[PDB]
Design a protein around this ligand. Structure first.
Ligand SMILES: *C/C=C(C)/C=C/C=C(C)/C=C/C1=C(C)CCCC1(C)C
Ligand SMILES: CCCCCCCC/C=C\CCCCCCCC(=O)O
Ligand SMILES: CCCCCCCC/C=C\CCCCCCCC(=O)O
Ligand SMILES: CCCCCCCC/C=C\CCCCCCCC(=O)O
Ligand SMILES: CCCCCCCC/C=C\CCCCCCCC(=O)O
Ligand SMILES: CCCCCCCC/C=C\CCCCCCCC(=O)O
Ligand SMILES: CCCCCCCC/C=C\CCCCCCCC(=O)O
Ligand SMILES: CCCCCCCC/C=C\CCCCCCCC(=O)O
Ligand SMILES: [Cl-]
Ligand SMILES: [Cl-]
Length: 264
């Protein structure tokens, strides 16, 4: 049901995708260790924001690892090209994983925005409902990326509606609570918003690849887009969230944070 199943791959195409996914694994687990060791310099009220990055690193790292092994399982070098064998490859499992990772990305944002209690619970709930609506309708959509392009587009339109509404909630909370933020992170959080708009928008572009480049090179392009998007939306994003957590910790008087920033 996925366009990946339609083609044979050159050694070059096959190895590049393998390397992309493998590099993706290494980057996420490398970052995991960074987030782990810096977590001790985060004040208690923000420390969960950094823990969520650890959770995202392993979750994303495991899905990339799984995709890579699925890739090598599904294809074998036969008569001059990599051809589909008995096992299958699908991006569908990425969509399932987003059900967990996207709420984590959103939650760590709300935390450094200094949301608390009732407003935190209600905002998170609406955000998670919006994200799940987006992910589920998108998941259904890509089931048709070979059989019914028109259906892919319509489900994608519905998914985009959830996407836009989700982004509106995010933008609204960011620009409203920007003023509450310490240590100059009121400026930093603005760049985080634009990072999200950029990085998250790569995913619907990848989703549409079967519509504008239905060939083996389009398969490579999609994996390339996912890699750029994953690293940007999880790793670079996580680094900015953690930086914001540490800076606000130090400004709030948390001594290990102040000491940490003093060494650099
Ligand atoms: C770490 C993974 C992240 C942040 C994934 C985000 C995914 C999206 C923003 C996907 C959105 C989609 C649309 C807006 C339309 C097509 C269907 C989706 C699910 C690919
Ligand atoms: C930086 C270099 C990126 C690696 C290019 C891989 C493409 C290829 O060798 O076919
Ligand atoms: C934050 C951005 C992270 C970027 C991660 C991607 C790094 C490697 C990117 C690809 C370089 C281009 C490789 C050339 C493709 C060769 C085509 C092919 O053989 O299939
Ligand atoms: C392999 C990676 C090992 C990572 C273990 C690092 C322990 C961190 C100690 C700590 O800060 O609590
Ligand atoms: C095949 C039917 C698909 C139904 C989509 C449901 C939308 C989910 C919305 C938020 C939870
Ligand atoms: C909740 C929203 C659920 C879907 C709204 C209907 C529009 C997209 C469904 C397309 C159905 C189809 O193409 O067969
Ligand atoms: C050409 C690859 C990069 C595309 C970036 C534009 C998409 C995000 C826009 C906001
Ligand atoms: C080419 C450019 C690639 C960008 C690489 C991004 C690397 C990590 C981002 C680190 C986030 C730190 C927040 C900004 C620090 C500050 O505000 O002074
Ligand atoms: Cl605290
Ligand atoms: Cl993920």
């Amino acid at each position: 049901k996925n366009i990946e199943s339609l083609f044979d791959y050159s050694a070059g195409q096959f190895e590049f995708i393998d390397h992309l996914l493998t590099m993706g694994v290494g980057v996420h687990f490398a970052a995991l260790i960074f987030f782990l060791v810096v977590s001790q310099f985060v004040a208690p009220k923000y420390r969960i924001a950094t823990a969520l990055s650890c959770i995202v690193m392993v979750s994303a790292g495991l899905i990339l690892n799984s995709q890579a092994v699925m890739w090598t399982d599904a294809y074998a070098y036969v008569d001059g090209s990599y051809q589909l064998q008995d096992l299958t490859f699908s991006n569908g499992y990425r969509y399932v994983n987003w059900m967990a990772t996207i709420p984590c990305l959103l939650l760590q944002l709300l935390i450094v925005l200094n949301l608390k209690g009732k407003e935190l619970f209600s905002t998170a709930t609406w955000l998670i409902l919006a994200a799940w609506g987006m992910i589920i309708t998108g998941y259904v959509g890509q089931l048709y990326e070979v059989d019914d392009i028109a259906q892919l587009m319509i489900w994608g339109a519905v998914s985009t509606a959830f996407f836009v509404v989700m982004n509106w909630i995010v933008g609204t909370k960011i620009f409203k609570n920007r003023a509450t933020m310490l240590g100059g992170t009121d400026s930093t959080i603005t760049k985080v918003f634009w990072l999200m708009m950029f990085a998250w928008t790569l995913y619907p572009i990848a989703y549409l690849v079967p519509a504008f480049m239905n060939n083996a090179d389009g398969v490579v392009l999609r994996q390339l887009l996912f890699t750029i998007a994953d690293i940007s939306s999880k790793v670079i994003y996580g680094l900015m969230i953690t930086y914001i957590a540490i800076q606000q910790s130090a400004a709030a008087g948390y001594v290990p944070a102040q000491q940490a920033l003093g060494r650099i």
